[model samples]
Target: GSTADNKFNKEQQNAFWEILHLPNLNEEQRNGFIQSLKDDPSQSANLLAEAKKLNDAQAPKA
Candidate 1:
């Protein structure tokens, strides 16, 4: 079922922490993305890139 829990290997857990330190993510967004990674750590790069795109869109124009 879609509600089933996902698990991370030790390496992925460590990678998750490293992802946490990515400077561009805001605190709230970071926390949310970290939880998202818990469900599918391999998607971290894709998700982070998407967040970066969203953030860029929201930034003030020069």
Candidate 2:
């Protein structure tokens, strides 16, 4: 499901902004991800999940 209105709750908006400022993201990655999020605002959860998955995969094994 998607909303053309592009409205999101406070937490979701904060999450999006936080992702934009993540230190590890380069200019290209940042722009691309931000654009992707704008293209599909409803996918905030999935987008953050994917980011976490990538980070977990790259972390040193405990």
Candidate 3:
């Protein structure tokens, strides 16, 4: 199943994160990963573009 299959919102986003199989990651490591994303505008831009593409493609057509 695709990531989008289980994730249409933030609740599902957390679930998808849990599914990433990163059991060794501590809370601080996880937070650091997320914070690093926020701190890097270029990386954030790429991620945001990817997310928007996913959302736009997944959305039902009118």
Model number with the top TM-score: 2
TM-scores of the candidates in the order shown:
0.45, 0.63, 0.31
lDDT head-to-head 1 vs 3, winner: 1
> Considering every candidate listed, which one attains the maximal lDDT?
2
TM-score between model 2 and native: 0.63
- For candidate 2, write residues 1-53 as lDDT tens digits: 74576675787776576666655545455466667776788887777666555
Ranking by lDDT: 2, 1, 3
Q: Can you write out model 3's per-residue Cα lDDT over 1-62, one digit (the tens) per residue?
A: 73323222663344335423234444454454444444553354444444445445554553
C-alpha RMSD (angstroms) for model 1: 5.3
Error of 1 at 5 (Å): 15
The candidate 1 region of ten consecutive residues with least summed lDDT is 3-12
C-alpha RMSD (angstroms) for model 3? 14.4
Total clashing pairs in model 3: 0
Error of 1 at 31 (Å): 1.5
lDDT of each: 0.61, 0.64, 0.43
- Model 1: residues >4 Å from true position, as ranges? 1-26, 60-62
